[PDB]
Design a protein around this ligand. Structure first.
Ligand SMILES: CC(=O)NCCc1c[nH]c2ccc(F)cc12
Ligand SMILES: CC(=O)NCCc1c[nH]c2ccc(F)cc12
Lengths: 172, 172
């Protein structure tokens, strides 16, 4: 995956988020620190927060990441698209996990009612674990794919089943 | 625990894998042809067992005392879904699912290679995205989970231009 996409993946709350542009940051709702009143030095007042279930978009009134170009955010992807989930692990290891995407789905995963785009890992058979699968610290990692000369972001990591085979991408 | 990934080590023109503190496996063609030592041990001290494109090194002292010993087998049952544990010099980790087939002598680009055939499960193509193998990946291990037990069953020897078909060299 290109260096510019890994540069947009920022450690945030109990997981990650992703810079779409110099002013737009996307993440999974449950990783946001609940008492928090300031983000990258800016008060709530100065930020437009757009929340659709486990998807949250932050639009800043100033350029927080002026090193970046704006890229395309889409509302999920066609069923059958192979995406990479851009996961950072212990000590600059970079894990772009291959996922085949499926339908929009509503599930119950552990306690929780989860809604988003389902997909199946293409890493291995019984992927329940940090070596071939996702862990709770991965929530907010972006789902990306290459589409002609362009890369697209189409969601953020929200959940995985007890077997680890099935993942859920929160979508705008 | 040490992760599986800490066992995958840069070696020669590719990679290899620590099965135990004293046992290292790799692809024969990536081993240097001019050497007096490996991993700081004199070649005097190293047992080398070659069988076509599969090589095993047995050291006389513990090079990786942090590891436990893993199950090494001579390939796996047809239909097993393995993971090829690819490391790249970017710092990326690429576990790719492979459906394993028959032992054969296969024509792969110019070349006759003997080992276990497999097909990558990332489909359409790996062209643009982190979804296939490249020449520098030779020696990456093939692994799978069986009950609570991780099994290593061979090393990455070859792949087609296409990228669909791979060869896993196995112990003889
Ligand atoms: C992977 C990654 O985040 N890299 C950049 C780190 C960084 C430096 N200065 C910043 C200001 C805002 C922000 F969100 C990130 C940064
Ligand atoms: C233990 C075991 O047998 N696993 C399933 C084998 C398998 C993987 N990918 C497939 C795609 C089509 C198909 F017909 C079979 C497979």
């Amino acid at each position: 995956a290109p260096p510019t996409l890994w540069s947009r993946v920022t450690k945030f709350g109990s997981g990650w988020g992703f810079w779409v542009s110099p002013t737009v940051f996307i993440t999974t709702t449950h990783v946001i620190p609940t008492s928090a009143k300031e983000f990258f030095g800016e008060p709530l007042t100065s930020i437009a927060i757009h929340r659709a279930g486990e998807f949250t978009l932050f639009r800043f009134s100033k350029k927080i990441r002026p090193d970046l170009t704006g890229m395309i955010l889409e509302e999920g992807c066609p069923e059958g698209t192979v995406c990479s989930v851009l996961i950072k692990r212990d000590s600059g290891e970079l894990l772009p996990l291959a996922v085949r995407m499926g339908a929009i789905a509503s599930m119950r995963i552990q306690g929780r009612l989860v809604h988003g785009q389902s997909g199946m890992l293409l890493t291995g058979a019984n992927a329940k674990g940090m070596d071939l699968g996702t862990i709770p610290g991965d929530c907010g990692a972006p789902y990306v794919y290459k589409r002609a000369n362009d890369w697209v972001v189409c969601g953020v990591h929200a959940a995985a089943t007890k077997s680890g085979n099935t993942v859920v991408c929160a979508v705008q």
